[PDB]
Amino acid sequence: GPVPSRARVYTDVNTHRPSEYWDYESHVVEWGNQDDYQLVRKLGRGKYSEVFEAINITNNEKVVVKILKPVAKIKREIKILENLRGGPNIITLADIVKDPVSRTPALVFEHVNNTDFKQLYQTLTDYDIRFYMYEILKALDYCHSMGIMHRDVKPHNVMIDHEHRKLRLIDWGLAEFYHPGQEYNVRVASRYFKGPELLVDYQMYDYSLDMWSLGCMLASMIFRKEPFFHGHDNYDQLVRIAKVLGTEDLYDYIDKYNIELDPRFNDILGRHSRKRWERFVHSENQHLVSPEALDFLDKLLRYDHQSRLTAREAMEHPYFYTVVK
Ligand SMILES: Nc1ncnc2c1ncn2[C@@H]1O[C@H](COP(=O)(O)OP(=O)(O)OP(=O)(O)O)[C@@H](O)[C@H]1O
Ligand SMILES: NCc1ccc(OC(F)(F)F)c(Cl)c1
C-alpha cells in the first residue's frame, strides 16, 4: 500500500485548537438580513455559485454577494472564512444571509475592484510579479499556519486592485482543514494548477499542494506562457509536467510513496530528461527572468510535495529581496 505522508510544518495545529475550530459540521450559522442588501449586477456564474455586485444599504458600502448553488459543504467554507477573517490578504466575509429565491445561503464579502486578468498579466513588470507573489505568500502562510489548505490556488482566485496595489485570496469553497494522516479527495484545483500528488491519486497530501499551484502561476507569469503546463486532460497534464521535470524524478517520487501509475500512462508518458529552466527564456520574457526567479521556481515545482518550499521559506527567498517591506 502507499507510504503515509505528513506536512513538515503546522502538522498538529488542528489537534491543539478547540474542536469547534475545525468541526465545521457542529458550527451554528447566525443569519444576517437579506433586507440589508440590494443586488446591482451579475458578475459571474460558476458550477458552485452566482456572484453579484451589491450595495449594503445599512452603511452604503459596495459588497459582493456569492449565492451558493445547492451542492452541504457550505458550513466548511463559512467556518474557514470566519477562522481566517482579518488575516493578511484573506477576503473578508462580512455577512451570511438566506436568499429568499434560491433558499440557499448567500455569502456577503468586501468588494475588490479586480483589474481584468488578461489585462494585468500582460502589463506586469518584474517588480510587480515579485510584489504580488509576496502578497499571495502572506495569505498562504497565514491559512497554512491556521491549519487550512486552500486547494484552488489559480489567477482567477486572486483578486487584484492594481491602482491601489491591493490583493485578496478568494474562493475558499474547496479549502479544507489539514489533519495529519487524513486522506483527502484528489478532485481539487483547476487542471493546470493540480499538483503531481493529485495527478497520481496520492490522497495524503497537505498545504504543499498550494505551493505547487503557486509555482504554476509564477512560471506562467515570468515565462509569459498561460498556462505553463497546458494539459489536454488530467493524464496529459502529468505528461506535460514530465516533459519539463523529467520522468526519472517522477519515478523516484512515486517509488518513495510506493504509488503505482495508472496503466494508461504506459502508452503516453515515455522517457523525458529534466529540462533546465533557462530553456523557457526568450526575448519576449527575458526582462521577467533572473537567476533568483529561476532558483525560486525550481524550489516550488518539485514532484515530491515534502521537498517544496513552504510558504514561510518561500518568503525568505532572494527573489523577494528587491520587494519593499
Ligand atoms: N470580493 C470580490 N470582489 C470582486 N469580485 C469578486 C469577489 N469575490 C469574487 N468575485 C468574482 O466572482 C467570480 C467568481 O467567484 P468565486 O471564485 O468566489 O466562486 P466560484 O463558485 O468558484 O465561481 P467560478 O467557477 O466562476 O470561479 C469572479 O468573476 C470574481 O471576479
Ligand atoms: N486574477 C487577477 C490576477 C492578476 C495578476 C496575477 O499575478 C500576479 F499575482 F502576479 F499579480 C494574479 Cl495571480 C491574478
Side-chain angles (χ1 to χ4, degrees):
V3 164
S5 174
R6 315 184 291 148
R8 293 183 71 189
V9 298
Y10 308 128
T11 318
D12 320 304
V13 289
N14 288 316
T15 41
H16 290 99
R17 273 180 182 266
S19 79
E20 293 100 327
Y21 181 86
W22 52 263
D23 183 21
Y24 54 87
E25 283 283 19
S26 69
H27 174 71
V28 174
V29 170
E30 293 177 350
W31 302 94
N33 249 15
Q34 66 91 15
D35 310 343
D36 296 0
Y37 307 97
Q38 220 168 52
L39 305 178
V40 173
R41 65 180 175 112
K42 201 174 177 187
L43 292 173
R45 187 203 274 164
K47 297 191 184 181
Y48 285 99
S49 77
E50 289 185 16
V51 173
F52 300 84
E53 190 187 310
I55 294 294
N56 178 335
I57 72 168
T58 73
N59 56 29
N60 225 318
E61 305 264 301
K62 287 247 211 175
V63 293
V64 160
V65 179
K66 178 180 186 183
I67 310 174
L68 302 169
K69 272 183 175 65
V71 52
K73 289 255 141 69
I74 289 144
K75 288 218 182 167
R76 186 177 67 188
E77 178 171 5
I78 286 167
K79 193 68 209 187
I80 287 168
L81 283 167
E82 291 187 347
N83 289 344
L84 303 178
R85 177 195 280 142
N89 298 330
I90 304 294
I91 196 78
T92 297
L93 178 67
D95 212 344
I96 306 151
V97 300
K98 193 176 173 77
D99 191 82
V101 175
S102 69
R103 300 166 84 233
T104 70
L107 299 180
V108 179
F109 296 96
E110 63 177 320
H111 180 268
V112 178
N113 194 7
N114 183 229
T115 312
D116 289 345
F117 165 53
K118 282 178 178 187
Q119 186 189 315
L120 201 52
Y121 162 93
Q122 288 296 345
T123 68
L124 286 203
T125 65
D126 173 41
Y127 185 80
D128 287 2
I129 295 170
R130 303 179 196 222
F131 179 90
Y132 289 130
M133 288 278 301
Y134 194 76
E135 296 298 307
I136 298 159
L137 286 166
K138 290 189 190 162
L140 294 180
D141 186 48
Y142 191 67
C143 72
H144 294 171
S145 80
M146 295 289 279
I148 295 149
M149 49 188 171
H150 185 277
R151 310 192 304 174
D152 200 25
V153 172
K154 61 175 183 174
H156 276 151
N157 287 344
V158 178
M159 298 293 94
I160 297 152
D161 176 347
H162 197 42
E163 207 196 323
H164 304 102
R165 306 181 69 83
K166 196 163 112 285
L167 187 144
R168 295 292 182 268
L169 181 58
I170 66 153
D171 194 10
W172 298 81
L174 282 186
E176 253 296 1
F177 290 88
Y178 177 67
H179 294 281
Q182 183 157 133
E183 286 184 328
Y184 292 97
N185 195 319
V186 300
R187 294 210 127 184
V188 295
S190 295
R191 185 187 312 140
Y192 310 131
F193 302 87
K194 287 174 191 283
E197 51 268 59
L198 304 186
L199 302 172
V200 303
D201 207 12
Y202 188 77
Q203 294 181 78
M204 209 174 288
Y205 62 81
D206 59 69
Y207 314 108
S208 54
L209 168 60
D210 295 334
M211 301 308 294
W212 174 273
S213 308
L214 186 73
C216 293
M217 291 186 44
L218 179 63
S220 67
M221 278 179 260
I222 69 173
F223 292 137
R224 295 241 151 153
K225 192 190 169 294
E226 53 173 36
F228 189 68
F229 296 128
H230 200 193
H232 182 68
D233 50 57
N234 291 347
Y235 304 98
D236 183 54
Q237 189 65 24
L238 187 60
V239 180
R240 295 306 188 121
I241 295 169
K243 287 183 168 188
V244 175
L245 290 195
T247 48
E248 288 172 294
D249 288 346
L250 176 54
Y251 275 104
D252 281 350
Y253 174 53
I254 68 167
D255 291 353
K256 174 177 174 184
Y257 300 93
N258 290 40
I259 294 157
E260 253 193 295
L261 285 176
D262 184 329
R264 291 177 218 246
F265 285 109
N266 302 157
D267 291 359
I268 61 169
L269 187 64
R271 293 195 293 170
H272 302 282
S273 52
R274 172 182 257 270
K275 302 312 180 298
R276 304 211 190 252
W277 294 110
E278 291 83 357
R279 212 176 83 172
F280 305 99
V281 180
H282 51 61
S283 62
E284 287 66 48
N285 66 25
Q286 66 184 142
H287 67 290
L288 309 174
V289 187
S290 60
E292 293 86 0
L294 301 184
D295 186 74
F296 178 45
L297 183 65
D298 187 63
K299 297 173 159 52
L300 294 177
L301 298 183
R302 295 280 177 88
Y303 286 118
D304 187 357
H305 48 280
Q306 286 183 4
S307 299
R308 295 174 202 146
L309 287 177
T310 60
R312 199 63 192 264
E313 286 180 310
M315 293 170 74
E316 305 281 295
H317 196 277
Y319 181 63
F320 299 107
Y321 288 179
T322 195
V323 178
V324 171
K325 301 174 275 300

